[PDB]
Design an enzyme around this catalytic site. Structure first.
Site, PDB file in Angstrom:
ATOM      1  N   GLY A  24     -17.011 -49.624  19.542  1.00 30.64           N
ATOM      2  CA  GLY A  24     -15.563 -49.627  19.610  1.00 30.64           C
ATOM      3  C   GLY A  24     -14.964 -49.040  18.351  1.00 30.64           C
ATOM      4  N   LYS A  46     -19.698 -52.129  10.650  1.00 28.50           N
ATOM      5  CA  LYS A  46     -18.251 -51.935  10.598  1.00 28.50           C
ATOM      6  C   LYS A  46     -17.940 -50.964   9.464  1.00 28.50           C
ATOM      7  CE  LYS A  46     -13.890 -54.461  10.049  1.00 28.50           C
ATOM      8  NZ  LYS A  46     -13.268 -55.800   9.853  1.00 28.50           N
ATOM      9  N   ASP A 133      -6.594 -67.023  12.209  1.00 32.02           N
ATOM     10  CA  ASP A 133      -6.599 -66.060  13.306  1.00 32.02           C
ATOM     11  C   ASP A 133      -7.600 -66.453  14.387  1.00 32.02           C
ATOM     12  OD1 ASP A 133      -5.854 -63.878  14.779  1.00 32.02           O
ATOM     13  OD2 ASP A 133      -6.947 -62.400  13.581  1.00 32.02           O
TER      14      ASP A 133
HETATM   15  C1  LIG Z   1     -14.028 -58.158  21.656  1.00 29.74           C
HETATM   16  C2  LIG Z   1     -14.734 -56.917  22.036  1.00 29.74           C
HETATM   17  C3  LIG Z   1     -16.079 -56.480  21.955  1.00 29.74           C
HETATM   18  O1  LIG Z   1     -16.408 -57.546  21.573  1.00 29.74           O
HETATM   19  N1  LIG Z   1     -17.025 -55.420  22.249  1.00 29.74           N
HETATM   20  C4  LIG Z   1     -18.471 -55.507  22.124  1.00 29.74           C
HETATM   21  C5  LIG Z   1     -19.065 -56.221  21.102  1.00 29.74           C
HETATM   22  C6  LIG Z   1     -20.444 -56.282  20.975  1.00 29.74           C
HETATM   23  N2  LIG Z   1     -21.107 -57.033  19.914  1.00 29.74           N
HETATM   24  C7  LIG Z   1     -20.580 -57.220  18.574  1.00 29.74           C
HETATM   25  N3  LIG Z   1     -21.319 -57.821  17.673  1.00 29.74           N
HETATM   26  C8  LIG Z   1     -20.844 -58.000  16.453  1.00 29.74           C
HETATM   27  C9  LIG Z   1     -19.574 -57.554  16.102  1.00 29.74           C
HETATM   28  C10 LIG Z   1     -18.841 -56.924  17.090  1.00 29.74           C
HETATM   29  C11 LIG Z   1     -17.424 -56.394  16.858  1.00 29.74           C
HETATM   30  C12 LIG Z   1     -16.551 -56.828  15.880  1.00 29.74           C
HETATM   31  N4  LIG Z   1     -15.421 -56.136  16.013  1.00 29.74           N
HETATM   32  C13 LIG Z   1     -14.248 -56.287  15.175  1.00 29.74           C
HETATM   33  C14 LIG Z   1     -14.311 -55.307  14.011  1.00 29.74           C
HETATM   34  F1  LIG Z   1     -13.317 -55.596  13.130  1.00 29.74           F
HETATM   35  F2  LIG Z   1     -14.150 -54.039  14.475  1.00 29.74           F
HETATM   36  F3  LIG Z   1     -15.518 -55.398  13.391  1.00 29.74           F
HETATM   37  C15 LIG Z   1     -15.532 -55.266  17.055  1.00 29.74           C
HETATM   38  C16 LIG Z   1     -14.606 -54.328  17.579  1.00 29.74           C
HETATM   39  C17 LIG Z   1     -14.958 -53.539  18.663  1.00 29.74           C
HETATM   40  C18 LIG Z   1     -16.220 -53.669  19.237  1.00 29.74           C
HETATM   41  C19 LIG Z   1     -17.124 -54.587  18.720  1.00 29.74           C
HETATM   42  C20 LIG Z   1     -16.770 -55.396  17.615  1.00 29.74           C
HETATM   43  N5  LIG Z   1     -19.377 -56.791  18.273  1.00 29.74           N
HETATM   44  C21 LIG Z   1     -21.233 -55.630  21.896  1.00 29.74           C
HETATM   45  O2  LIG Z   1     -22.621 -55.695  21.780  1.00 29.74           O
HETATM   46  C22 LIG Z   1     -23.287 -54.713  22.517  1.00 29.74           C
HETATM   47  C23 LIG Z   1     -20.654 -54.910  22.924  1.00 29.74           C
HETATM   48  C24 LIG Z   1     -19.275 -54.848  23.032  1.00 29.74           C
HETATM   49  N6  LIG Z   1     -18.682 -54.087  24.120  1.00 29.74           N
HETATM   50  C25 LIG Z   1     -18.563 -52.646  24.014  1.00 29.74           C
HETATM   51  C26 LIG Z   1     -18.209 -54.763  25.312  1.00 29.74           C
HETATM   52  C27 LIG Z   1     -16.711 -54.491  25.458  1.00 29.74           C
HETATM   53  N7  LIG Z   1     -16.026 -55.677  25.940  1.00 29.74           N
HETATM   54  C28 LIG Z   1     -16.734 -56.871  25.507  1.00 29.74           C
HETATM   55  C29 LIG Z   1     -15.994 -55.628  27.390  1.00 29.74           C
END
Ligand SMILES: *CCC(=O)Nc1cc(Nc2nccc(-c3cn(CC(F)(F)F)c4ccccc34)n2)c(OC)cc1N(C)CCN(C)C
Length: 287
Positions: A24, A46, A133
């Protein structure tokens, strides 16, 4: 009278990360392979304004100082041209998860998520830490049976008096909106909104109402409605988290006890149609 924060900030080499894909935006999915020890760790990365560094370093400070099974663990930072390396939670944030799997979330999973979030929140209160938050979007899912609290970009180490900035208005207590006061009990309010999001399978709080009117609505005595699947027992707990008197709201250690009792007979407290038929090492094992 404060204790020395002897937490360790681990600094990792960039040559140890294998940015697999983008999750993302930027947050990347990847692998951390420490040199020597044959171990691959699924991580999230990140990834130059001097403000942005100062803030992501503040978050790295908080995440390095917490260690709890229901709080997101920090593995380290990489000082390239600054990256947070956190444990990969493969099922995403809990807000999108309940929205995706609305037709498969049982009352067991809902009540157990409430227990686990209260445990991590009570631990943060033990560390004298105000989250500021807490929301369903900031709860990550390791497995459907295991969630952890994340996103400490507003976390503060102790009441706290903020001085301004963008803040998620529909999750914060009345005292936080009017006087910019944040306590562990203002987190309890946000916990109540977070439980409401789960029980409504991801509905948006005060959907449609502009954030500028939230302060007026709450002063009038109006609160979030009772979710359809919620018995009066569960909805009473949310209502108690939304008291104007912050000290009348329940403690996190009490919310653990209450929801644990409910988790022993989930169908008695959540009425859901069809509730009956619903060298890689994880970071938690690399110590
Ligand atoms: C809430 C959305 C999302 O969670 N997408 C997601 C996340 C993950 N795993 C994961 N593990 C650790 C940290 C994160 C993560 C943290 N942030 C916030 C920031 F500030 F950007 F760090 C995220 C933002 C955007 C994406 C992920 C972040 N995530 C995962 O593991 C494979 C997959 C996904 N998706 C792409 C699924 C999308 N949604 C859940 C449907």
């Amino acid at each position: 009278g404060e204790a020395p924060n002897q937490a360790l900030l681990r600094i990792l080499k960039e040559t140890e990360f294998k940015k697999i894909k983008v999750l993302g935006s930027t947050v990347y999915k990847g692998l951390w392979i420490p040199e020597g020890e044959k171990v691959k760790i699924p991580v999230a990365i990140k990834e130059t304004s001097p403000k942005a560094n100062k803030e992501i370093l503040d978050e790295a400070y908080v995440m390095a100082s917490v260690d709890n099974p229901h709080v997101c663990r920090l593995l380290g930072i990489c000082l390239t041209s600054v990256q947070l390396i956190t444990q990969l939670m493969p099922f995403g944030c809990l807000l999108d998860y309940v929205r995706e799997h609305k037709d498969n979330i049982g009352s067991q999973y809902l009540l157990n998520w409430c227990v686990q979030i209260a445990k991590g929140m009570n631990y943060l209160e033990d560390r004298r830490l105000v989250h500021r938050d807490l929301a369903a979007r900031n709860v990550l899912v390791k497995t459907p049976q295991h969630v952890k609290i994340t996103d400490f970009g507003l976390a503060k180490l102790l009441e706290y008096h903020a001085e301004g900035g963008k803040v998620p208005i529909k999750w914060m207590a009345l005292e936080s909106i009017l006087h910019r006061i944040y306590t562990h009990q203002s987190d309890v309010w946000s916990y109540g909104v977070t439980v409401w999001e789960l029980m409504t399978f991801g509905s948006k709080p005060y959907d449609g109402i502009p954030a500028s009117e939230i302060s007026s609505i709450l002063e009038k005595g109006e609160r979030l409605p009772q979710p359809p699947i919620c018995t009066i027992d569960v909805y009473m707990i949310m209502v108690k988290c939304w008291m104007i008197d912050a000290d009348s709201r329940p403690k996190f250690r009490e919310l653990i006890i209450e929801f644990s009792k409910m988790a022993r007979d989930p169908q008695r407290y959540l009425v859901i149609q069809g509730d009956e038929r619903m060298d890689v090492v994880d970071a938690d094992e690399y110590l």
